[PDB]
Amino acid sequence: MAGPLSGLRVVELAGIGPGPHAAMILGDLGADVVRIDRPSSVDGISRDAMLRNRRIVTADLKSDQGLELALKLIAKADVLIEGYRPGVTERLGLGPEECAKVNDRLIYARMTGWGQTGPRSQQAGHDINYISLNGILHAIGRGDERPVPPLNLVGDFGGGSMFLLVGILAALWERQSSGKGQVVDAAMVDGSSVLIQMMWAMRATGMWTDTRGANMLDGGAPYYDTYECADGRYVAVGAIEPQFYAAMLAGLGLDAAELPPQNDRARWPELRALLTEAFASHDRDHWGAVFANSDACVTPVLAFGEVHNEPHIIERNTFYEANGGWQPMPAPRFSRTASSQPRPPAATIDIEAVLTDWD
Amino acid sequence: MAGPLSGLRVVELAGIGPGPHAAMILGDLGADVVRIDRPSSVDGISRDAMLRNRRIVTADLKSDQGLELALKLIAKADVLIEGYRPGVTERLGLGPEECAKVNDRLIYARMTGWGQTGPRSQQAGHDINYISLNGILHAIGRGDERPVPPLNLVGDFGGGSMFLLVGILAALWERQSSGKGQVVDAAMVDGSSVLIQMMWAMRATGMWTDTRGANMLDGGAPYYDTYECADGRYVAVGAIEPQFYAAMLAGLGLDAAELPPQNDRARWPELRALLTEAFASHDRDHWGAVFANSDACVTPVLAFGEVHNEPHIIERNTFYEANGGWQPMPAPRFSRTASSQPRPPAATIDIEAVLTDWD
Ligand SMILES: COc1ccc2ccc([C@H](C)C(=O)SCCNC(=O)CCNC(=O)[C@@H](O)C(C)(C)COP(=O)(O)OP(=O)(O)OC[C@H]3O[C@@H](n4cnc5c(N)ncnc54)[C@H](O)[C@@H]3OP(=O)(O)O)cc2c1
Numbered sequence: 001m002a003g004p005l006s007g008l009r010v011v012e013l014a015g016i017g018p019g020p021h022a023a024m025i026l027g028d029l030g031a032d033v034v035r036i037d038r039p040s041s042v043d044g045i046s047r048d049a050m051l052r053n054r055r056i057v058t059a060d061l062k063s064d065q066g067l068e069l070a071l072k073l074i075a076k077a078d079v080l081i082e083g084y085r086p087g088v089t090e091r092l093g094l095g096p097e098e099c100a101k102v103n104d105r106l107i108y109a110r111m112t113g114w115g116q117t118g119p120r121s122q123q124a125g126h127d128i129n130y131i132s133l134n135g136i137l138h139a140i141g142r143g144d145e146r147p148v149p150p151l152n153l154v155g156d157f158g159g160g161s162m163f164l165l166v167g168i169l170a171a172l173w174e175r176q177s178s179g180k181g182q183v184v185d186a187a188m189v190d191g192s193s194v195l196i197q198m199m200w201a202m203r204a205t206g207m208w209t210d211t212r213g214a215n216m217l218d219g220g221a222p223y224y225d226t227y228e229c230a231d232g233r234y235v236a237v238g239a240i241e242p243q244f245y246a247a248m249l250a251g252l253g254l255d256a257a258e259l260p261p262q263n264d265r266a267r268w269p270e271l272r273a274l275l276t277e278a279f280a281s282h283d284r285d286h287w288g289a290v291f292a293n294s295d296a297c298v299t300p301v302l303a304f305g306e307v308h309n310e311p312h313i314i315e316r317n318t319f320y321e322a323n324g325g326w327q328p329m330p331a332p333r334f335s336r337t338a339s340s341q342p343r344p345p346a347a348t349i350d351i352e353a354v355l356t357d358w359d
Numbered sequence: 360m361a362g363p364l365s366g367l368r369v370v371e372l373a374g375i376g377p378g379p380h381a382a383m384i385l386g387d388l389g390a391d392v393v394r395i396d397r398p399s400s401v402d403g404i405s406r407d408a409m410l411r412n413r414r415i416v417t418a419d420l421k422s423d424q425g426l427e428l429a430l431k432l433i434a435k436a437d438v439l440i441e442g443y444r445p446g447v448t449e450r451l452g453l454g455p456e457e458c459a460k461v462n463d464r465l466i467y468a469r470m471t472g473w474g475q476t477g478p479r480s481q482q483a484g485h486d487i488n489y490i491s492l493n494g495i496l497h498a499i500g501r502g503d504e505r506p507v508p509p510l511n512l513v514g515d516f517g518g519g520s521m522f523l524l525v526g527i528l529a530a531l532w533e534r535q536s537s538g539k540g541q542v543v544d545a546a547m548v549d550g551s552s553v554l555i556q557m558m559w560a561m562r563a564t565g566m567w568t569d570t571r572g573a574n575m576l577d578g579g580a581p582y583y584d585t586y587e588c589a590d591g592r593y594v595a596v597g598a599i600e601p602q603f604y605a606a607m608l609a610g611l612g613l614d615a616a617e618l619p620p621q622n623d624r625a626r627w628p629e630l631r632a633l634l635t636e637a638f639a640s641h642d643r644d645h646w647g648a649v650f651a652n653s654d655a656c657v658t659p660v661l662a663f664g665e666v667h668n669e670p671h672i673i674e675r676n677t678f679y680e681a682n683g684g685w686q687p688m689p690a691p692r693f694s695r696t697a698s699s700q701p702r703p704p705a706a707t708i709d710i711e712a713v714l715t716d717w718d
């Protein structure tokens with residue numbers, strides 16, 4: 001199995017969102033990932049590409065046999081991932097304490113939104129809920145409108161699965177000294193807060209307000225935002241540094257002497273009006289050509305369906321094809337132990353067959 | 360130093376955005392993190408809380424002695440982080456090959472937006488540019504308006520720093536059985552693509568469209584969006600599962616028989632108008648009360664300045680007070696080798712001192 005996590009053994013208690021995304025990435029990087037789903041799901045080969053790089057098995061964990069097979073896998077494995085509410089694994093007899101008895105090397109990885117304790121710890125929720133409580137959601141969107149969710153990118157993945165991965169891998173490093181596993185408690189409300197640590201830093205030194213749409217990086221700055229072009233398509237401008245901004249202005253045909261200063265916030269209305277009219281005078285692909293190879297920090301805003309035609313995407317093999325859709329190749333990349341293309345979702349396997357293969 | 364990464368040694372070449380954030384999280388979890396900045400940008404103690412859990416040293420990396428001192432640190436370290444354009448460290452004489460001569464065990468971690476090669480590899484850029492190229496930015500915001508940047512959470516951090524971290528830590532795992540370091544190439548355009556793999560998965564199965572504002576998770580769904588309340592503040596609704604959705608409707612006072620089906624997308628505008636009127640009839644705090652302990656997936660949308668007053672935040676110590684104000688505590692959390700509260704930004708210490716300390 002290709003990639004730097006070759007050798008690593010993972011048991012995933014089938015959940016939704018962050019838990020499977022984390023499991024995917026471990027699989028992506030060479031880990032041997034075994035997913036235990038309930039039989040009343042298992043029903044043909046999955047069409048969910050998030051379930052690549054996996055062996056799937058069936059098992060009623062509420063039964064005594066189910067529980068005991070599960071515990072035979074966990075015994076032989078390096079990592080467990082579960083993303084159920086707190087208390088669920090306990091009551092199945094797969095809690096940390098029960099796992100610690102069959103395998104004290106286990107990294108016991110717990111993926112929740114709210115955490116293991118506290119008033120909200122039993123509330124159902126999704127990404128939008130977890131980022132609503134910690135100030136994030138309120139900061140996303142235009143100022144004249146209600147906040148808009150940044151898909152489920154910030155809570156589920158960036159502040160969720162990815163923190164679970166760091167915890168798992170950090171715990172694996174620790175286990176090199178101590179010879180012992182441990183419990184990783186990854187809550188989306190916490191991960192996503194560390195994810196936005198920059199804003200908390202800026203807020204403390206007066207460089208970020210709580211007003212939505214009035215900061216440097218939320219769309220309030222005329223030089224960090226999207227613009228509509230003549231064809232109704234969009235470009236992105238990210239020209240923070242004065243030298244990049246100057247390069248953008250020159251490409252736009254605007255003399256700096258006619259414009260307000262870049263960071264005179266009081267004249268941002270005028271500046272935005274000027275930039276808006278300039279970008280609106282030609283189509284997206286015009287701007288993309290004008291500014292290619294430039295430090296102007298102007299790029300075309302591509303739709304998913306166009307991404308496969310962008311030279312830089314094609315050339316670095318950011319995507320691969322699988323079953324009527326492109327999918328992202330593993331990230332990040334490794335010089336010596338490269339990851340390989342992901343294996344598609346496979347038909348189910350017997351849990352005994354797995355135990356055999358794992359000795 | 361507390362945390363699972365006690366005794367990891369990390370040398371950071373100072374840049375902006377993702378490199379510093381990854382360094383921070385390594386520090387947070389107890390790594391020994393030494394950051395080399397340039398003498399000209401450093402006076403007092405840095406007021407950027409992202410520079411917590413670090414020792415800062417200056418060195419003109421363009422001098423012969425700056426370089427020599429630097430290579431001495433790196434020789435004694437486990438990880439090097441650089442976030443410059445490709446070719447920059449090479450010209451300094453700090454490229455992977457120079458480093459591999461003085462320490463074939465080093466994890467050489469390169470944080471870029473566009474990657475190490477390819478047509479865009481020398482272009483300046485920020486978060487908004489990297490997410491414009493791979494379909495992400497186009498998908499974020501309301502349908503009748505231009506895309507809105509999700510701050511810099513998705514490229515810099517979620518698809519940036521966090522992928523650098525997964526790479527550093529996975530390569531440390533690989534090293535334990537190979538005795539060798541290697542190069543980690545973390546490109547924001549790749550990481551953020553894997554970050555959004557769920558949308559690529561859904562798009563392949565006809566469950567996501569490239570139309571903005573028309574999907575389950577982009578704000579198009581009436582049961583996954585924010586709503587304005589009587590007081591002008593917001594709640595988030597995330598009631599995807601029909602049972603949670605039913606619970607929400609009951610607490611709104613809304614008879615499911617009067618309403619269109621939850622997932623009849625052609626009638627979503629009509630459903631939205633009914634939910635809008637209901638949520639608008641009371642203030643945010645009213646709804647927070649009504650739905651506490653509920654699986655209705657309704658939460659108050661708090662601004663940064665209100666987060667310190669939220670019971671669930673306070674009681675889990677998601678934050679600590681520092682500096683000017685609140686900052687996120689380390690994430691994720693560990694049962695045995697627990698992180699400690701971050702150390703504030705250091706005074707710049709002398710690079711020989713460190714070398715003494717590291718032998
Ligand atoms: C509908 O389709 C899709 C598909 C994909 C989707 C992807 C993403 C999203 C959105 C953005 C999300 O936001 S993803 C984040 C959700 N939150 C959490 O993951 C945070 C922490 N967990 C929870 O809070 C969730 O569990 C919950 C909110 C989803 C609650 O769900 P429940 O259905 O109440 O499940 P519980 O976790 O509490 O209990 C699970 C029950 O199943 C039993 N048992 C598990 N495996 C079993 C097995 N193999 N055999 C037998 N039983 C099994 C457990 O024992 C337990 O049963 P009980 O408690 O009744 O004893 C949305 C998406 C939506």
Ligand SMILES: COc1ccc2ccc([C@H](C)C(=O)SCCNC(=O)CCNC(=O)[C@@H](O)C(C)(C)COP(=O)(O)OP(=O)(O)OC[C@H]3O[C@@H](n4cnc5c(N)ncnc54)[C@H](O)[C@@H]3OP(=O)(O)O)cc2c1
Nearest residue numbers: 375376396397419420442443444471472483484485486511
């Ligand atoms: C202005 O204030 C803030 C503060 C905070 C900010 C936070 C976030 C952001 C936005 C959202 C971002 O998205 S952050 C991600 C940016 N992109 C990348 O990080 C991707 C990869 N790197 C790059 O592309 C960037 O380097 C660049 C786009 C910013 C390029 O800028 P350059 O300034 O040209 O820098 P280079 O990387 O090309 O080269 C740097 C030069 O510095 C020299 N030398 C470094 N350390 C030195 C030392 N100790 N001593 C002496 N010299 C040192 C190098 O040698 C190199 O020199 P040369 O000119 O010879 O090549 C924005 C934020 C903005």
